Design a protein that fits this description.
The PDB classes it as oxidoreductase/oxidoreductase inhibitor. The entry lists the keywords Ascaris suum, reductase, mitochondrial membrane, OXIDOREDUCTASE-OXIDOREDUCTASE INHIBITOR complex. The assembly is tetrameric. The complex is a heterotetramer. By secondary structure, chain A is α/β, with parallel strands linked by helices. Chain B has a single domain, classed as Up-down Bundle (3 helical TM bundles of succinate and fumarate reductases), CATH 1.20.1300.10. Chain D has a single domain, classed as Fumarate reductase/succinate dehydrogenase, transmembrane subunit (3 helical TM bundles of succinate and fumarate reductases, Up-down Bundle). In chain D, about 65% of the residues lie in helices and about 0% in strands. The chains are: A alpha/beta, B mainly alpha, C alpha+beta, D mainly alpha. Chains in contact: A-B, A-C, B-C, B-D, C-D. At the A-B interface, strand 1 and strand 9 of A face loops of B. Bound molecules: flavin-adenine dinucleotide (FAD), protoporphyrin IX containing FE, the ligand COc1[nH]c(=O)c(C(=O)[C@@H](C)C[C@H](C)[C@@H](Cl)CCl)c(O)c1OC, iron/sulfur cluster, FE3-S4 cluster (F3S) and FE2/S2 (inorganic) cluster. The ligand COc1[nH]c(=O)c(C(=O)[C@@H](C)C[C@H](C)[C@@H](Cl)CCl)c(O)c1OC sits at the interface of chains C and D. Protoporphyrin IX containing FE sits at the interface of chains D and B.
Amino acid sequence: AQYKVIDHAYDVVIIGAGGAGLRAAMGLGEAGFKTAVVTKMFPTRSHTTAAQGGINAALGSMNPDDWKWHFYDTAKGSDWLGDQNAMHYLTRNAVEAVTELENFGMPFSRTPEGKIYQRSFGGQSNNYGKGGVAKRTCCVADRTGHSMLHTLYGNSLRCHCTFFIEYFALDLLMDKGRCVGVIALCLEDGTIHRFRSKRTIVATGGYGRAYFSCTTAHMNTGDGTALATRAGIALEDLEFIQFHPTGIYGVGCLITEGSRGEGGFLVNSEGERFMERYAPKAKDLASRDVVSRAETIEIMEGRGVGPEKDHIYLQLHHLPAEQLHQRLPGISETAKIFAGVDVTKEPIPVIPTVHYNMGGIPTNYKAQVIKYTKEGGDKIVPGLYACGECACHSVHGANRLGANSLLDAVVFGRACSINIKEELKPDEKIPELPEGAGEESIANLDAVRYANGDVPTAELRLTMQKTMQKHAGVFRRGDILAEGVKKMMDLSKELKRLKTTDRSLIWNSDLTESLELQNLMLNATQTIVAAENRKESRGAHARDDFPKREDEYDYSKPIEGQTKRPFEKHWRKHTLTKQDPRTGHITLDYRPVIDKTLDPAEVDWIPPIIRSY
Amino acid sequence: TSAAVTGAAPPQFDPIAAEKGFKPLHSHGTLFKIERYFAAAMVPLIPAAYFIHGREMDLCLALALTLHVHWGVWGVVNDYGRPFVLGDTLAAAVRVGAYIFTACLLAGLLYFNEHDVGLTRAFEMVWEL
Amino acid sequence: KRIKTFEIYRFNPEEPGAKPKLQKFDVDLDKCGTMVLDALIKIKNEVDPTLTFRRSCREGICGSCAMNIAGENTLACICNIDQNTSKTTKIYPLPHMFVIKDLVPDMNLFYAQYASIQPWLQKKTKINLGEKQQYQSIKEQEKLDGLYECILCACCSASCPSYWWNADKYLGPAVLMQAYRWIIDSRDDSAAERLARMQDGFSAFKCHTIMNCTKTCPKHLNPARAIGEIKMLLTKMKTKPAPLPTPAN
Amino acid sequence: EKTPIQVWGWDYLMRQRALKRPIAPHLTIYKPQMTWMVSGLHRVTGCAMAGTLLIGGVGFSVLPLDFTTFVEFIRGLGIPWVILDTFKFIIAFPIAFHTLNGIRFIGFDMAKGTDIPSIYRGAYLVLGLAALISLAVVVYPRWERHKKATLPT
Ligand SMILES: *Cc1cc2c(cc1C)nc1c(=O)[nH]c(=O)nc-1n2C[C@H](O)[C@H](O)[C@H](O)COP(=O)(O)OP(=O)(O)OC[C@H]1O[C@@H](n2cnc3c(N)ncnc32)[C@H](O)[C@@H]1O
Ligand code: HEM
Ligand SMILES: COc1[nH]c(=O)c(C(=O)[C@@H](C)C[C@H](C)[C@@H](Cl)CCl)c(O)c1OC
Ligand code: SF4
Ligand code: F3S
Ligand code: FES
């Protein structure tokens, strides 16, 4: 066919308008750069707006805290797959990052003395895990992520970041391991845009839509992790797919974990607080990786509720309606509107739902993407960063901590604009593009657009999502997974039997969703193969045939004169899935988890303990 | 071919740089505050009209009705008389015509109370068949 | 098996001088979810993939599905289908918007108009961007309640016939209400000038007070209430500053 | 004198036309409601009254045919009272209503009474108080014109 191409040239181009997306844009613009921001949807539509429970920071507006206790619970939540340098940044900075929001304009809910109101949340406690339960979660009442996205958005207008709304990032501009920009389909007029820019930043959020059931938005197809898979980058920890404990039984939309930090709890068939048994001290505020597994067993064992005995109840109706107004307003409704529940008189239909993706594109403590052969360490990939849900500094490791995520976008999104006001010197001018620069990007678009074939873009997804949900669930075994990865991979062929109908350019939703599937398969696959190979049980990932957490020692027997287990035979290590998207096959390798802090002098590396909440 | 023209940044607003040169304060505020207060002072006027009659009411019914309506049909004419759909000259021409409406209504009313029965003896008459 | 029948604005802009036709779909309410959006994804996947529109969140929170269902501007995503199969529910894109395609209106105006109102925090003396929390007592921030939730779906706006007619010059419900949210933020010192921006006869005062906008907001907020309060600021009554960061702050 | 934004606003409208893009169906397709239709009625009355005050005002100046001929060149084929006592009702209502809804609209202008219940009350207690007065102002002196038709004593 025939297509129309455009060129721009920018300093820095950001493929995402998330929380991470915009905090970069706005620190980078206010620093004074030619910023382009490219997003397939208008920035208030980004998933970050869905965020509910809030954002973590030790501000102690409720009871004296230390940013270090937050660092702790974060490493804990990480299940020691989490790079502690990364988490050190996350937690010291959180105190400021969050405060900066208030100064930006975020209508934080209030203590009587006008400090930012803090709720309890899942997985946090004072005193290096030996106090009470934490009140360190910050929140605009109930729909916090929305208020932050609209705030981060508001401020994005003051810093001249010429926005490129409703363009679809196709592929990275690759010239020998260095990134020069992106190439986008413009929705509004089917034209194609080539972004020559010194740097690139990928803030595309997660891939929850790779499942039959997720809390995520229809747009979370993780095109970022494709863009970079397709530019020859290797992705990590894909297999760590947090299932949120409290997703609405039917339609699958998040009820906040906040509901629990305000005093709501989980209830079985005979209605006993069944976490007062699964996690004596933390209870219904245990980390999500452990509460969602806790829930799933009560099911298989018939203590479920409903007409079906296959989801459970979240009970809020005891709490005084005068606190359900101010503390949980937005989900009093999103429950009433979707499940018929007046949250002051009955419980809410909730089942674990695919929710967040620790997994993403490998990054050092400065948020710069990495290649890594066993040999010459982890080599930087120049001109490319990434942050938020979609990234993998692993500030999360095996299990995301509640409320860390918005913080992990705001913080590292900010750590793009700080770390680029660093090593970008006002000389090194606007990189020029290779001849034929992504001609193969558009050749794919064409292939897809006229895709004759016999399987609908629609159906294909459907069956992937359905397998992916059956085979990569909460509890995974070698028999389920191994056949999964065989099914899945016959599917990543069906793309050469794919079927569109909408032949056009100007807003072609059929064609973008087919691109969106194409990506989501490169996501789907690498996820389950990683999870099939992981012979351990740690974080969101949990095996029924490898039930022990497998580490370089054994942190029950007090280490004293144990020989270290060899790096091959233990799983306290990252998973780098590397796929060529043509053939569509994957080959693994394993980076070591970075254990040391950013500054040992300021605080100490918190060493692997018993994962017990 | 990826062999075609270099493009331009998309038409976007820029609240700050487009702020710099364009700072006049011409607040329609004060004017609006009155013409409500006016229709708010037109209230006791209208039921007094059911009751008190004759050539002295007549005058300042028509004198006060005029002022409300002049503004009214300005308000109306500024709405539907979109310069988009009308084009610039033909939109001045509905805006001019809106004073020609105001001015006329009055000549017509003034006349009516002067050489016909007046409004209050009109509203008597009709209310008698 | 009860078969509900939909009627949905179609526009194809790629076709040479094409007219906007209204398309007829039936859908089986038995193999389809509860809301309308559900039914829209059904008809794209199952019947006709060319049926184009905007969608995300799916939980009433982004506003991307805003369109005109059974006469009213509301969120396709949290809209129950008319359970009565003898009626025939029919769907249109936000009123008096320029349609790019099918259900997708050129939102760009609405968006720029937002940008106008300078929707960030501003103070009379600079302050240290990463330092302390500006005091705001609970009672001050209750004023922003009714206000911050706005998802910017543009339902209100595209429902206000003022906006239909003079979109160029009238900011319109959604957008105004937000500006107000910035003038009674007890923390924002630009009350003064932020009011100066919408002093003229069209941008602000072109509310002939119809009330269509509050009736249609799916988020059950109230834009009129604000506009009202703004008219009061443009004329008689005042914004009132905050009690100072009571010390130990 | 256009504010920075409205300049831009105009330019948009220019593009959007040059692009031959159509306009999303509005009043055609938008559902009848007690919000806009109240207002619209407030419109129609407002104008239709001033409408009369012109084709009436000027009407009679620039014509021969004075208003007192006009009352007779109608009562001269006097139609049964009920018909006539409806034109009374129609003539009164527009004033009855536009005035009621008037005080009302000002409330809305002052932020007052702008919630959906106290709005719909508004609409009814006005649309009510009008139709009621308008009939009670046409029918009450058609009363003392019947109580006098036969004087009991
Ligand atoms: C899913 C979710 C997550 C969530 C939550 C509730 C829900 C339902 N509640 C949270 C909470 O209370 N506290 C918290 O810390 N996190 C919470 N989360 C997680 C969090 O919201 C997200 O995981 C994270 O904020 C995601 O934000 P991020 O900026 O990283 O990315 P995004 O907001 O999800 O949106 C991605 C942007 O990228 C653009 N994009 C994606 N693909 C493309 C392509 N193809 N081309 C162009 N642009 C692309 C999108 O447009 C979007 O702007
Ligand atoms: C106490 C008596 C009255 C009050 C309180 C009143 C109130 C109002 C108000 C508040 C408006 C708002 C303007 C707008 O919405 O743009 C209006 C409009 C208008 N009025 Fe009145 N009104 C009264 C009587 C009348 C009468 C008797 C007439 C006819 C002669 C009239 C003619 C108009 C016209 C032409 C408009 C234009 C705007 C529109 O139709 O929506 N008014 N009125
Ligand atoms: C503000 O007053 C108004 N009130 C309205 O009911 C309204 C409308 O919705 C119109 C369909 C009704 C209007 C009076 C008609 Cl007769 C135009 Cl053909 C309208 O356009 C309007 O002007 C903006
Ligand atoms: S006021 Fe309501 S309907 Fe309008 S943009 Fe805001 S949320 Fe949407
Ligand atoms: S509909 Fe428009 S008239 Fe005002 S009441 Fe809402 S902005
Ligand atoms: S798509 Fe988010 S509102 Fe319906």
